C-alpha cells in the first residue's frame, strides 16, 4: 500500500564522508514517529548518484531493518544501464524490500522504445511491484502516457508512477492511459497539491525529511477530500519547498537538518557541503515560517 | 465579481471572413443560459492578433450589450505597444465593460521593468479592474510573481492574473507576493483542476466555448471544495482539454462547435480553417466521451 | 543583391517619442558611408511593434528616399495577421522598396501549414523578392527547412531567409531544401561567423547600427573568403556583440549610440530608455575594446 | 597535439553483448589508416554508461596498444561521482593515455561551483592534459564560460573543451574567458563547419566512426584556412550526420557500419539494436550520397 507522504531520505555521512548508519537510523526512526507513511533509501535524494554498489545495498538493508515492516520500503534501484538496475532490483527484492523505484534512464537517452525495454527488462526480472520514476528535469528523456500505459498492460508488477515531469496535465492523461488505479505519486513536493487533486494519492517527497509530521498531515488533509485544510499546510510549508531547491534539494535538506536537529550537512561530490548566504537564508526563513526553527 | 468558468469567447466568422455579429451574439446568450460566469470578448481565443481596431471595438460593444449586465464582462486588450493597449483599454471603459485581460507584451521581450511600466501606465489610465494575462507560451517573457506583486502594490486596479505558465508552484508563488485576496485564474484547461487546488478561484477557459454547462459545473465543484467532484468532471472533460489543444485551440474549439451546434469553422489566416485527420478524430471521440455527441 | 552587412535599422525618435527624421536620415547616411551593403528599416531593431501604420509608412519612405539607389532597401513588412502583412507589402511595394522582410507570425502560433499559408498569401501579393525571417526566440514558433523549401518550390519571390535560429545546422538543411541559391542571412550577430561558413552570404545586424565600418569589413573578410582575418574581427567585435543584447538589443545599442554619436536613448513603452548599470559598464568595455570610445 | 578529426570510437559487440576486441582493434586500425587524428575510447558513443568498471578499463588499455602512440589517445573518464571520475581517471593515466575527457556530472545537476569542485579535483590528481566535456543536452548543467576560465586559470592541466552546446557564440566567449590557446573541439558534427571558424581546432567525432577519411579530410581543410573546400565536405557529409541522429547516434553510427564494413548492430539496454524503416532509409541514402554505398 503506496500512499501519503513518503520521504527519498536523505543518506546522512560522517566528516569523512562515509555513510552514517547511526544517523541514518535515527532519521528513519523519526521519519516513522511523525507520521511518514513510507520509505524510499538511496533514490536521488539519498545520493544514489555518488554510492557504491556495496553502499546502495547496505543502505537498503539498513533501512529494511530499522523499518521493521511498520511501513513500505520502496528501494532506488536506479540506473542507466539496464543490467545495472536489474542487480540493483534484484538485491533490494532479496533484502526484504516492498517495492522498488525504477528511474528512466538518464545522459544516455535512449528511444521511447528503449524505455519500455529496459522497464520490461526489470519488470521480467523481479516480482516486486515497480514505480517508474519518471524525471525529464534530470533524464531528459520523458516517458510518454502511451509508453507507460504500455508498461501497464505488458506488466502486472508495474504499478504507479513517482512522476517529477511538472506537468499536471499528465496526471490526468496516466489515468487515461494507465487507468484510475495505477497509483501516481508527486515526484515535486510544491505541487503534491494539485498533483493528488489531479488523482495522485500522495508524494514520494524531499521537504518530509525536514517536516514529516507537517507534510503527514498535508497527504491526510487531502487523502480526506479536505482541500481547503491541504491548502492550509501548503501556505506552512511552501518556503520549505522553495527555498530547499534553491540550490540542489539535497543539500538545501541537509542545512535545514543542521539546523533543526544537528545533522552533518556532508555531501558526496560533486554535491557541495556549503550553499550560498541568500539560500541560507531562505532556508532559515522557511523553517521560522514552519514552526519548526524560532 | 470575476470567478468560476469565464470563456474566452471564439469571434465566429462568416465564409468570407467577416465578423457573424448573430452567430456571436447566439453564443453569448447560449454561453449565459448554461452557466458562464463571465465573458471574455476578444482575447487571444477571440482572434484578437486578426481583428481591426474596428471589429474588436465593435465585439467588445456586442458582447456588453448582449449580456446585459448578467454577468462580468472581462474585455481583451492586449497589444505588445503600451499606447494601443491603452487606446484599447479606454474603449472597453466608455463601452461598459466591467474588467479588462491585458497580455503581457509579446514579441518585443520587455524587460520585467518593462512589464511593469507597461501595465502600470494602463493601470493609471483607466478606473477598471485590470487582469494580467500572463502568458510565457505565447509571448516568451514571463511575469515575475515579484513584478506581480509590485503592481499589485503599486495599483489597487491590478487585481488578478489569468496564469498561463502551467507551473502550479506558480499560483502558490503568488498567493504569497500578491496576497490571498489577489484573484487567480487559470488560463489553461487541463491544469484548472489543480490551479484551484493551489488557491485559484477560476478558469478563463477555452474549452468553456464547446462545453459551458460542465466546466461551470466543474468549477462550481471546486469552488464548494468538492474535489472529487470536481475529479469527476476532469474524467469527462480531459479527452476534449487535449484534443482542442493537438492544433492551435481557436481551430479545434471551431471544429467542436461546427459538430455540435453548426458553427462556421472560418478562421483568418495564419490560422487554418482545417485540421489533421488525427486531432478531427480525436475531437469527435472526446465530445462522445463528454456525452456532447 | 541581398549581401553583406545590412543593419536593421533602429528608428531615432526624439524626447517626447516622436519619430525623429532628421536623426534617422543622417544614420541612414553615415550607415551608407560606412559601408553597409543594404537597409532594413522598421525591422525588430526598428521597434516596428510600436510604430503606427503611418509611422511605418514614412520611415519606409524616407529610408528609400536617403538611399537613393546606392544600397538595396529591405522593408520591413511584419505581422501576425496575414491581411495586415499584405498591406505593409504592398505599401513598401509601391514606395520603391526593392524587397520585403517578412517575420513568422508571433503570439497567435500558427502550424506549419499556417506558415505556408501566410507567406504564399504575401508572396502573390507582391511582386518583390521576400527574405522570411525565421525567429523562434520571438515567434515561438519555427519555419522548418521543408516548410522553407515548400515555400521556394511554390514562389519564385521568396527568395531568402534571415535565420534567427541560433541552429547552424540550420543553415545546411536550408541548402538542401531551399537550394545553394538560397539567399540565407543570419539573423545572429554573434554567430554570423559559423553562419556564413555554413553557406550564408550576410548577416541582417543590429551591430551594425553601432560599428557599421568593422561590421561591413568583417562580412567582406567571409565574402573574400579570409576566415582567419574575419575571426580578427570576431576577436574585437563579439564583446560588443554581447553586451548590446545582456538586455532588448534596441536599448543596449541606443546606449551605444548615446556614447559613440550623441542619439537619443529614447525608447517607446514597453521597452525602456534605460539600462541596468552592469548592462552599461560592459557596452562600455566592448566599445573601449572595439576601438569605438576610449 | 589535440586537434583535427577524432572519432569518439563505438565499442563493438558479439551477438551476446560481450565486447568484441577484435572487431574493437580492427575499428581503430582502419581509423587511424584513413586518416583520423587522436582516438575517443569510452566516449557516451562508446557506450560507457552501460559498460562495466573492468569492460571501460580494458577497452581504454586495447585502444592504447593499438594506436601505439601514432595518434593521441584521449581516454573517456567520465562520471557523475567525483570519486569515480578520480579512479578513472588515475587508471587512464596508469594505462598510458595521452589525455582525458571527462564529462560535466549529469542527472545530479551540481550547481557551477560544484561543477568547479569536481574538475579541479579531477585536475588535482592527474599530470595528463584534461579535455572537459560540456554537454548540456545530456548533462542538463552547462559550464559556464566564467566556470571554464577559472578551472583553466587554476589548473594548467585543464586545456581544452569538447564542447557540444550547440551554441557557437559560447567558442567565441570561451576564447575570451580560457585564451585563444585554449583548445576547443566540437561536440557535434553538423556544426563542426561553423565551429572551428570560431576558433575551433576540431571535432571529437560521431560521424567519424562512419567516414574516418572525408571527416579528416573535412578537418585539414579547415586547418588549412580553406573554408570554401571545408563547406564541400559539408555538402557531402551532411545527410549523414543528420541520419545517424534521427535515433540515438550509437545506434545509427552501428547501423551504417553495419552496411559499409559488416559491424554488428548489437548494443546494450536501454539502446535498441533495431531502427525504424524511415532511419534506415535515411541513413542508406546518405551513405550513397557520401559515397561509402552505390
Given at each position: 500500500?503506496?500512499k501519503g507522504s513518503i520521504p527519498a531520505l536523505i543518506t ?95 545522459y544516455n537517452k535512449p528511444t521511447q522504445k528503449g524505455l ?39 506488466h502486472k508488477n508495474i504499478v504507479g508512477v513517482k512522476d ?131
Open positions: 500500500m503506496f546522512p555521512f560522517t566528516d569523512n564522508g562515509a555513510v552514517d548508519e547511526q544517523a541514518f537510523a535515527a532519521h528513519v526512526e523519526w521519519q516513522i514517529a511523525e507520521g511518514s507513511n513510507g520509505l524510499v533509501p538511496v533514490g536521488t535524494t539519498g545520493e544514489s548518484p555518488t554510492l557504491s554498489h556495496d553502499e546502495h545495498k547496505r543502505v537498503v538493508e539498513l533501512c529494511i531493518e530499522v523499518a521493521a515492516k511498520r511501513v513500505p520500503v520502496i528501494a532506488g534501484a536506479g540506473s542507466n544501464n539496464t543490467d545495472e538496475a536489474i542487480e540493483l532490483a534484484l538485491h533490494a527484492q532479496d533484502a526484504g524490500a516492498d517495492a522498488l523505484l525504477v528511474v528512466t534512464p538518464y519500455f525495454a529496459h522497464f520490461s527488462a526489470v519488470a521480467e526480472a523481479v516480482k516486486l511491484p515497480i514505480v517508474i520514476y519518471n524525471i525529464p528535469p534530470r533524464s531528459v528523456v520523458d516517458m510518454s502516457p502511451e509508453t507507460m500505459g504500455a508498461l501497464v498492460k505488458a517529477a515531469t511538472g506537468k499536471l496535465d499528465r496526471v490526468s492523461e496516466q489515468r487515461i492511459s494507465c487507468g484510475k488505479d495505477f497509483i501516481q505519486l508527486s515526484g515535486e513536493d510544491s505541487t503534491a497539491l494539485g498533483f493528488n487533486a489531479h488523482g495522485g494519492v500522495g508524494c514520494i517527497s524531499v521537504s518530509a525529511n525536514v517536516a514529516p509530521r507537517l507534510c503527514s498531515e498535508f497527504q491526510a488533509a487531502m487523502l480526506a477530500g479536505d482541500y481547503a485544510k491541504a491548502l492550509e499546510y501548503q501556505d506552512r510549508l511552501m518556503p520549505l519547498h522553495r527555498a530547499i531547491f534553491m540550490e540542489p534539494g539535497v543539500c538545501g535538506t541537509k542545512y535545514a537538518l543542521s539546523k533543526t536537529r544537528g545533522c552533518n550537512r556532508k555531501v558526496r561530490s560533486p554535491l557541495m557541503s556549503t550553499l550560498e548566504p541568500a539560500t541560507e537564508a531562505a532556508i532559515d526563513a522557511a523553517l521560522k515560517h514552519a514552526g519548526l526553527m524560532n
